[PDB]
Amino acid sequence: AVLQAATGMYEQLKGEWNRKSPNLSKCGEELGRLKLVLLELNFLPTTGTKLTKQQLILARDILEIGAQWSILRKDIPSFERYMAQLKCYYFDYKEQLPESAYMHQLLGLNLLFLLSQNRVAEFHTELERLPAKDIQTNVYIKHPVSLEQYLMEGSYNKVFLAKGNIPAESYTFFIDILLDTIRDEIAGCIEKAYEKILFTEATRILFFNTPKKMTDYAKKRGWVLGPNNYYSFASQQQKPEDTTIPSTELAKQVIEYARQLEMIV
């Protein structure tokens, strides 16, 4: 009865969400009302045995839509909540549950989301849950992992190009958050690497379209603009400060040697 009802309002959410212009409000209340129904129908079953497969198949679907619905309104806590439950339906009951068509696209969204929040330590762990074959094969998985290599190796130009070649239209959101981090990062590279750069020489480096977009970013970064359109980055004078001998640290260490030679008895 309830299970036959359970698929009932799911199609109301499925039909509304699949519409070319879905509403975030009504789907939110529909999603908010949906999760309460799942709780009676063994939501997130513990040690899932051979129970009704319809509940397992259906419950994943709302989480799949809900995770995909979360980033439409661009909120972080909603995605973490839905994908946390979604990961349960992707690996735990997978011997019962059929391989979801959207499971690889949504998992890669989690991987790309982790890069946006700079939780790179968690990025590789969740990448471990995937089989090693689809890491280098599936497009939805290959794109986030390749971007991580570009980010760590410094290929900042390819990070911006990753926007054009995203596997799915769902991927666009987390790119925007990640791109803001890159812009501050690459500028940090310029201060320590470049002693001096020309004003529009940094346009393709910073991937700024409008030259005015440098001016507001310059004062935020506090970059001293020079008369020859030259940004002077003279800041290496703050060396590791070899000018000072760490006598206290040195005296502490050498004293400890005397302790290991005398305090033993």
Binding site: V120, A121, E122, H124, T125, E126, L127, E128, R129, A132, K133, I135, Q136, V145, Q149, M152, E153, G154, S155, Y156, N157, K158, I186, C189, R204, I205
Partner: protein, 242 residues
Amino acid sequence: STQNRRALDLVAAKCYYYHARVYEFLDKLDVVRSFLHARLRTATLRHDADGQATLLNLLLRNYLHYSLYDQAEKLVSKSVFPEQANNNEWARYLYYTGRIKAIQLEYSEARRTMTNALRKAPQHTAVGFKQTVHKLLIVVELLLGEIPDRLQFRQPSLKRSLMPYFLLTQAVRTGNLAKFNQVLDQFGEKFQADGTYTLIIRLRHNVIKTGVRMISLSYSRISLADIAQKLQLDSPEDAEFI
């Protein structure tokens, strides 16, 4: 489980080790996880030094078999391994923790444990364990930017097993992307079947790192286009950010 004897704790640890072995061949490894956790708390509360050490190793193997590296990191973060444990049980813990640290980008602490795991391994037996730790230590050493010891590739037992990693170390040493990629398209399946493919992928950034290091160490002033050619990058503008 019903008994509460003290010297039985020494026998029970061996029974737990083989009780995970029967399910290892049964390929379930999930029903035993509840029993291991329940027995671990029983052993921990009784200050079962030998029993706690074996169950912690068995649990780490359980989590690592299903790629639950998050689960095993949490367990080692809270559980305290018995200091007065067997050397054969310490070696597994150092490897499992070392593999855990390797995935979590904690290479520096991973290398210490894996090196420690080799030291406490048996001197004449447990060859398969030595090969597994050697394979992971080579990658971690390459991931850390250090150099693998050439002697470990000379051993009769390790020569055949470490050969794909020997070619991988050679490619990383030259700091050339083309040489590193050639190893990947040739030994990719072996790395995957060895459980180390993920860490080799991260070596691409390290190959760039070492190649840049020799360029700066050898050239006082080098053109960016020449840097791209020497590192086999795509364009000088990409080498500019690198």
